[PDB]
C-alpha cells in the first residue's frame, strides 16, 4: 500500500526546510538515484559514484557526465553541432 | 572465575595493528596472541582483480616458484587481458599491412 501521498523520497526530511526546497530536491534526488542506459554496455546499469562520474555496473566502463544526470541538454546540443561541423569539414 | 587480562603491547592505544585474540594455555591460563594484518595479493594491471594462484603472504617469505605463474605475463595480466592483447596486436598488423 502507498505510504505517502506527495512527499515521496523527501519524507526523510520531516517538517523541516519549507515547501519550495523540498519540491526542488524531489526532482534532483530522483534524477541522481536513477539507473541509466550504458551507451556501450547496451544495458541499464549506469549509476553515479561522484558528482560527475558514472560507472556501468555490468561492463565496468566509467564516464564523465552531469552532476545529477548522466547526460545534459547543453552537451547533447554541443555534440550534435560538433559532429555537423566535422562532417562539413569532410568535403 | 575471573578471565580479565592486561595489555601485551608497549602502549594500550588500540590501533589496527594492535589487535589480539584469546586462547587457553596448557597451564590453565588465558593468554593474548596478536592477530597480524593480512596483506592483499597482487592485482591485474589492466582490470584490477586478484591474480589467481598467489597466496596472501608477503613475497619475502615465499619461495620463487610460489610467487609466479607459468604463462607469458604470468603475474601481471589475468589471461583474458593477455588474450585481448594478442588479438589486438595480430589483427592490427593484419589491418595495417595489406589494407
Amino acid at each position: 500500500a502507498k505510504r505517502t501521498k506527495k512527499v515521496g523520497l523527501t519524507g526523510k526530511y520531516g517538517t523541516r526546510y519549507g515547501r519550495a526546497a523540498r519540491k526542488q530536491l524531489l526532482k534532483i534526488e530522483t534524477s541522481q538515484k536513477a539507473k541509466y542506459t550504458c551507451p556501450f554496455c547496451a544495458k541499464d546499469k549506469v549509476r553515479r559514484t561522484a558528482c560527475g562520474i558514472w560507472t556501468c555496473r555490468s561492463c565496468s566502463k566509467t564516464m564523465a557526465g552531469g552532476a545529477y544526470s548522466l547526460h545534459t541538454e547543453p552537451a547533447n546540443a554541443a555534440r550534435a553541432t560538433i559532429r555537423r561541423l566535422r562532417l562539413a569539414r569532410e568535403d | 572465575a575471573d578471565c580479565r587480562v592486561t595489555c601485551r603491547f608497549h602502549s594500550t592505544y588500540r590501533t589496527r595493528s594492535k589487535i589480539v585474540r584469546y586462547k587457553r594455555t596448557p597451564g590453565n591460563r588465558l593468554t593474548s596472541l596478536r592477530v597480524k594484518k593480512l596483506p592483499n595479493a597482487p592485482h591485474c594491471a589492466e582490470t584490477g582483480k586478484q591474480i589467481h594462484g598467489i597466496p596472501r603472504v608477503i613475497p619475502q617469505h615465499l619461495t620463487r616458484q610460489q610467487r609466479k605463474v607459468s604463462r607469458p605475463y604470468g603475474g601481471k595480466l589475468c589471461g583474458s587481458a593477455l588474450r585481448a592483447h594478442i588479438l589486438e596486436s595480430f589483427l592490427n598488423e593484419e589491418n595495417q599491412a595489406l589494407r
Binding site: - | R71, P72, R83, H85, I86, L87, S89, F90, E93
Partner: protein, 129 residues
C-alpha cells in the same frame, strides 16, 4: 562458405604456457565429445642474436600438443609441413615417442631457419607495446 581448420594452417596460440606463439596444425580431430581438437606443432623458443665475433645459442625448441580449437586464431600464412608422415597417434600418451618426436622436429625447424624459409612463421609477434 568453406572450412578454415585444415592441416597446413598456421595459428596463434591464445592460452597456456605458449600463449602468443605461432604453431602449425599437424592434424585435425573429429568432433565426437569434449569439443574440437587438433594436433599442433609449434615453436617454444627462437634462436637469438649472433654477431660475427654458438650451437647453444642457435638451437631451436619446439612443442607438439593437442589443443582446443577455441584456443586458436587462424592466419593467412601457411607452412607446407613434412610431419604428416611422422606417426601422429604415438604422439599422445606415448611419451617415449613424444620426446624423440620433439628432437626430430627441432632439427628440421633449425634447418628451415638456415635456408631462410617462412619468414612470417619464424618471426616474433609484438605484444603490449
Amino acid at each position: 562458405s568453406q572450412p578454415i581448420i585444415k592441416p597446413g594452417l598456421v595459428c596463434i596460440v591464445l592460452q597456456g604456457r605458449h600463449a602468443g606463439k605461432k604453431a602449425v596444425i599437424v592434424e585435425a580431430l573429429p568432433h565426437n565429445e569434449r569439443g574440437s581438437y587438433a594436433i599442433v606443432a609449434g615453436i617454444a623458443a627462437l634462436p637469438r642474436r649472433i654477431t660475427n665475433s654458438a650451437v647453444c645459442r642457435g638451437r631451436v625448441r619446439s612443442f607438439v600438443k593437442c589443443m582446443n580449437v577455441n584456443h586458436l586464431m587462424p592466419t593467412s600464412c601457411r607452412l607446407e609441413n613434412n610431419y604428416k608422415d611422422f606417426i601422429s597417434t604415438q604422439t599422445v600418451a606415448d611419451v617415449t615417442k613424444r620426446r624423440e618426436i620433439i628432437e626430430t622436429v627441432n632439427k628440421d625447424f633449425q634447418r628451415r631457419i638456415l635456408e631462410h624459409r617462412d619468414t612470417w612463421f619464424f618471426t616474433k609477434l609484438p605484444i603490449d607495446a
